[PDB]
Design a protein around this ligand. Sequence first.
Ligand SMILES: *C(=O)[C@@H](NC(=O)/C(=N\OC(C)(C)C(=O)O)c1csc(N)n1)[C@@H]1N=C(C(=O)O)C(=C)CS1
Length: 508
Amino acid sequence: GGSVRHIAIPAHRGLITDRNGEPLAVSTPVTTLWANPKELMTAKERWPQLAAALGQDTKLFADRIEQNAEREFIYLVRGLTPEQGEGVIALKVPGVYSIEEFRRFYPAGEVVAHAVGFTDVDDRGREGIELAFDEWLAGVPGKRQVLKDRRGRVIKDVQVTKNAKPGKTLALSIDLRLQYLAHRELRNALLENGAKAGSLVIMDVKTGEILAMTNQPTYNPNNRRNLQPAAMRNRAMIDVFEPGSTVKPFSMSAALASGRWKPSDIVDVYPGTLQIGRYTIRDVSRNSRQLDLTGILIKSSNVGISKIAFDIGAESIYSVMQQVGLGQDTGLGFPGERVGNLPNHRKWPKAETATLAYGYGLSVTAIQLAHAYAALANDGKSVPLSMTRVDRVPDGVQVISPEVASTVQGMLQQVVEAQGGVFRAQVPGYHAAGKSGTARKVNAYRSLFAGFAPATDPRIAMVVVIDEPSKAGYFGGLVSAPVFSKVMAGALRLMNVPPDNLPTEFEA
Ligand SMILES: *C(=O)[C@@H](NC(=O)/C(=N\OC(C)(C)C(=O)O)c1csc(N)n1)[C@@H]1N=C(C(=O)O)C(=C)CS1
């Protein structure tokens, strides 16, 4: 007797590695016990011992089987060892079956959870890379012919009609060594500042590769028990924030490209405030009069950058920030990734011109901010972003001219190295460049640092975001700059970049 039926052959999900082959998401065998209730209903005498072997109350187990008496498949328990599955099979209960199924394990756990994401119990990607590249990773299930008796029990395997096709291996752009370093130091910074959250992005300025992307809080994707959704946010891609002063190098790029400004030109910022009708632009350091363009960045003078913006026009500044990608679609396609907002106007009055120029009222992601600094470091050329390992580098787009980019690079090196600069961002053994930011949330603060290294031949761009530090310190040059120093120092050494901060003949 029996009936001819076709059943599926699950496909083996593809391995996800870092850029060097280190396993990040692996489908490994676990032993699973399942049951056909229609068969179980013929051997009720065996139920209590089966319940006991499954750690179930006898009556709760007997109730569950009765409530599913019309189904032909229920799970008993998933994730045993082969030895554990055999002990239950040794009861020889009709309708109880053991199978080996491949389920996801994440060997680096919380360290790359936001980037990698996870699959559901149907093993379909639902977060992070697992979702974004689900088609690549999933493969194609097969089909095989069976004969089933009246209860649904397979009584003969007839033939395979189509073989399963396994999913494909995927190598991410992430370097797990940099990821671990970034993860540990971001975690340390949250403790030292009693901060609520944070992000750290590392990018290869020559290839567009996202070398590291970590956030706090994070979660263990191997133990998703009562996960708070806040811990699951890949903030670097799905949270927007005001970049504030960290956009001032792009305002400065527009200034230098206009033909009306050189680094040694001077701006009077006395007395540290600038009234624009009912609005008042304010500096924190208000013991300045004449500042040159590098000093405007070193002191992070909102007044100074605003006066420059009045001279060159907001349109030139908006265009640079648009070109380097701030508030613009990255095109990556990460689930929930935000585009943000670069505010636009028909005509730009002084107030809107000033706030644009020092990053007030803008919305960007940490990925966008890092990509913009990568283009600046790469002599003004923006290489497309990638979450996967890049073997053939695609052509970039020139978004800032090489001469202007090179001059702004040198100014940003001075921001880190010059007297009164952001000395905590200095990278031991290397010349580094960057810009701090401190944004008041609308007192709560967000502490920023963005930069790149080595200055002589940039390789890595990095953004550090510390959300709501609660200690006495909250300025970006105190809170986020030291994280940049430690992570950049380690990342450059892990990538075997030759140190470039060597004495001249006279300094030796
Ligand atoms: C650049 O980020 C500048 N930040 C600001 O003007 C902002 N806030 O300034 C503080 C002092 C935090 C305030 O409470 O007003 C700002 C920009 S967008 C936003 N929502 N707030 C300057 N940056 C620095 C740095 O280099 O971190 C300073 C040292 C002084 S303020």
